[PDB]
Amino acid sequence: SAWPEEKNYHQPAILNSSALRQIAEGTSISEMWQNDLQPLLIERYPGSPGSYAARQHIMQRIQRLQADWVLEIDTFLSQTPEGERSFSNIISTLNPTAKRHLVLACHYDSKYFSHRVFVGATDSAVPCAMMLELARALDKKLLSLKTPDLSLQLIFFDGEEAFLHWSPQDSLYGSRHLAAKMASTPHPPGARGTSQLHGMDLLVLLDLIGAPNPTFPNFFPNSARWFERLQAIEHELHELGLLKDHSLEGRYFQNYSYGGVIQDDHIPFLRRGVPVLHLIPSPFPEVWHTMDDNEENLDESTIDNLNKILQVFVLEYLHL
């Protein structure tokens, strides 16, 4: 039937001032930092001990929550410039059999560099922490989903980074795999025509977050009305005095276009028709692909602000 089009007419349920205050109070940037971010600041390129530890960390942090998250590990083999490697996407789903999910994603691998070590704080340890912080902060509300046909999913992609220099064949290992897999998988089971890709309302991909004064442009016409929601949320939170070290002149969400094409985990989803809201700034952080992409260079207030915005957005999307 026509359920794959419901995404196109889906509206937010907009939060009042007293609700926005409650969400602002319910996230803890220091707990994220201590409990979510710090354990991820390790070398975690595919097959390294760090990759296994990051993966166990993300799963433990998720399982400890009340909401009925279902984890799945999507593990596969691929040739690389270094020889064959194993890769493990982490998918964490509420209500797997619901036709529709809002999808938040990042990558949890770190790009390999020869020796100081590269731990890619903004790239993408912070995105990971933010997702885990969202799950934690919204737990009580997300628990209410264990009872339209729409829920939430988190994807932590492996193998986003090139091993050598970026090419079509050396990058996006995990996202190219999972997109192809979802494209061939009936959803709901027993349905004709419709895939798991049909079920993805919107893919919200966080990447390179945590540098000061980020500017996210409005990359895609087909997510522009959700981008406008992010601008609105930032604007109301500011006016309500719920953001820190934030100016309307220095706002994160700015309605301008972007000139090129960014390659990232959304690419295999976008080319098959999935709507993408790509929360990657332009320019990239100053420390991009640098040993200085580290904890010290992160802006805690900025990240805390983005947490508030993203959490409101997600509640508003899911009607919670």
Residue numbers in the entry: 34 to 148, 152 to 183, 189 to 361
Paper text:
Glutaminyl-peptide cyclotransferases (QCs) convert the N-terminal glutamine or glutamate residues of protein and peptide substrates into pyroglutamate (pE) by releasing ammonia or a water molecule. The N-terminal pE modification protects peptides/proteins against proteolytic degradation by amino- or exopeptidases, increasing their stability. Indeed, its crystal structure revealed that a Zn(II) ion bound in a tetrahedral coordination to Asp159, Glu202, His330, and to a water molecule. All X-ray crystallography experiments were performed using the hQC double mutant Y115E-Y117E (hQC-2X), formerly validated by us as a soluble protein variant exploitable for drug discovery purposes.
The crystal structure of apo-hQC-2X was determined to be 1.96 Å resolution, in the monoclinic space group C2. The crystal asymmetric unit (ASU) contains three independent molecules that are almost identical within experimental errors (pairwise root-mean-square deviation, RMSD, values of 0.11–0.14 Å). The tertiary structure of hQC-2X, having the mixed α/β hydrolase fold with an open sandwich topology, is not affected by the removal of the functional metal cofactor. Indeed, the structural comparison between apo-hQC-2X and the holo-enzyme shows no meaningful difference, as indicated by RMDS values ranging from 0.21 Å to 0.24 Å. This evidence suggests that the binding of the metal cofactor, although critical for the catalytic function, is not necessary for the enzyme to acquire the proper folding. Upon removal of the metal ion, a water molecule, WatC, populates the cofactor binding pocket in all three subunits composing the ASU. WatC donates two H-bonds to Asp159 and Glu202 and receives from His330 and a further water molecule (Wat2), placed inside the catalytic cavity and bound to Trp329. On the opposite wall, the indole moiety of Trp207 is rotated inside the catalytic cavity, contributing to the cone-shaped active site. The crystal structure of apo-hQC underlines the robustness of the hQC active site cavity that maintains its structure even without the metal ion. On the other hand, this scarcely flexible cavity indicates quite strict requirements for molecules that can be hosted as either substrates or inhibitors.
